[PDB]
Design a protein around this ligand. Structure first.
Ligand code: 1JD
Ligand code: GLC
Ligand code: NA
Length: 443
């Protein structure tokens, strides 16, 4: 146990580590905003064309598509005035591997089939509506309804997409199918969508964050600081793409053996390193690799590992969450037996410690990110204590039994001059795309 706890201790980050990360994130943000350094910035600070504007939208029905993982969502969002009301209906769709690792057209054809299914099941296929698209990958926006995919993240691979107008890809697929018509009026990031949906509930919400399969944030920047887009008046949402923080070496002093290994076998070696420390795509696999380290030292399972624990990806991140949901070891035993293992009573405690060590580092790394954003915003204003609302969506955050609590407390220590309200978005990644579309249509 002695030696377990010092192998596990490599995952600790001191206050001083977290402040260093925070400040470096603030300097990368700043690099990404300036024309002189934008092109070489690891933290891209992408203009979204979502602006501060008087409250209100068109009234009516709006479709939303939300693509950001293997599971995706179609939504019908009805905006009405009394005063305002928003009601939603959704369906979920799972994308087969074939459709994610083939061509862009195969991917967008599958998407359009699903839209078709949604419209059938809501007896509205004869209707032509405005559609907002939540598309959760790095995009260079040229307008609210136009954007070029820079690169796939989170293991997506469809060919023929990178470098192309993602909105064009959707619209072409819709037309190929010829079974329905929609006006694609807006495409946004999931961070952005989450923030808009949250703003609707709370006007102080000016940051969106995702801690899901990937990890990213967006926030409202002053237009004079957004040098890529002409104008000094008002604010525009910037999609930080903070996932790529570290991709210029900024994190090198913190990366562990397990981190290099996750990166090397990932779909995108050398990219999204910050996100690899945090996102649900990778947390379960980090844990897996730590559990193997403790085995090949004969500190775990008497040094015998199962077939499935030697198998990349078999420690799914939902396991990490379930482990930590356990004190009778029932939750831990039920995940471990699943894996072809026979834990002692001590192993169960060891696996729960390992989960904790990875999941805690994630919450801590993530808090430094968000603190960076929130402190920068405070500094750009007339704030003694800044009260701000953050919209947060993602499965790590919503479902991980203690990640959230750990994240909040770490965030608060790094932001001792702000009071932060975190709003857990029920379906903001999807609803927000509809609401942005409604605002866009009001033109
Ligand atoms: C092209 C375009 C479209 C939209 C926007 N801006 C917005 O959608 C703004 C962004 O504001 C940030 C600070 C979050 O958000 C909104 N701008 C205007 N009205 C809005 C909202 C959000 N809800 N909401 C709203 N409020 C009341 C009823 C219905 C709605 Cl949709 N900018 C450009
Ligand atoms: O889904 C959360 C995030 O995952 C990845 O970081 C994507 O690059 C990013 O665009 C998205 O916001
Ligand atoms: Na500007």
């Amino acid at each position: 146990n002695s030696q377990v706890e010092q192998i596990l201790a490599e995952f600790q980050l001191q206050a001083a580590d977290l402040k260093k990360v925070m400040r470096r994130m603030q300097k990368e943000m700043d690099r990404g905003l300036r024309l002189e350094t934008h092109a070489a910035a690891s933290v891209k600070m992408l203009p979204t064309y979502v602006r501060s504007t008087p409250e209100g939208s068109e009234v009516g029905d709006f479709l939303s598509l939300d693509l950001g993982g293997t599971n995706f969502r179609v939504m019908l969002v009805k905006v009405g005035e009394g005063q305002w009301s928003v009601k939603t209906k959704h369906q979920m769709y799972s994308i087969p591997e074939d459709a994610m690792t083939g061509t862009a057209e195969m991917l967008f054809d599958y998407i359009s089939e699903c839209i078709s299914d949604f419209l059938d099941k809501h007896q509205m296929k004869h209707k032509k509506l405005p559609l907002g698209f939540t598309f959760s990958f790095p995009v260079r926006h040229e307008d609210i309804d136009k954007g070029i995919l820079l690169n796939w993240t989170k293991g997506f691979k469809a060919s023929g997409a990178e470098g192309n107008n993602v909105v064009g890809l959707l619209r072409d697929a819709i037309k190929r199918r010829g079974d329905f018509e929609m006006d694609v009026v807006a495409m946004v990031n999931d961070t952005v969508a989450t923030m808009i949906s949250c703003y609707y509930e709370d006007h102080q919400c000016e940051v969106g964050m995702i801690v899901g399969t990937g990890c990213n944030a967006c926030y409202m920047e002053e237009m004079q600081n957004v040098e890529l887009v002409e104008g000094d008046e008002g604010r525009m949402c910037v999609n930080t793409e903070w996932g790529a923080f570290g991709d210029s070496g900024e994190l090198d002093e913190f990366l562990l053996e397990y981190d290099r290994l996750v990166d090397e076998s990932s779909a995108n070696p050398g990219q999204q390193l910050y996100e690899k420390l945090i996102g649900g795509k990778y947390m379960g696999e980090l844990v897996r690799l730590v559990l193997l380290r403790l085995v090949d030292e004969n500190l775990l399972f008497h040094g015998e590992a199962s077939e499935q624990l030697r198998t990349r990806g078999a420690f799914e991140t939902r396991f990490v969450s379930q482990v930590e949901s356990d004190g009778d070891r029932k939750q831990i035993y039920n995940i471990l037996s699943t894996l072809g293992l026979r834990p002692s009573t001590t192993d169960c405690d060891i696996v729960r410690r390992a989960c904790e060590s990875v999941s805690t580092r994630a919450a801590h790394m993530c808090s430094a990110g968000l603190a960076g954003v929130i402190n920068r915003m405070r500094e750009s204003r007339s704030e003694d204590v800044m009260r701000i609302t953050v919209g947060v969506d993602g499965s790590v955050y919503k479902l991980h039994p203690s990640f959230k609590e750990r994240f909040h407390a770490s965030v608060r220590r790094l932001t001792p001059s702000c009071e932060i309200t975190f709003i857990e978005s029920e379906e903001g990644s999807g609803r927000g795309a509809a609401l942005v579309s409604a605002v866009a249509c009001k033109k």
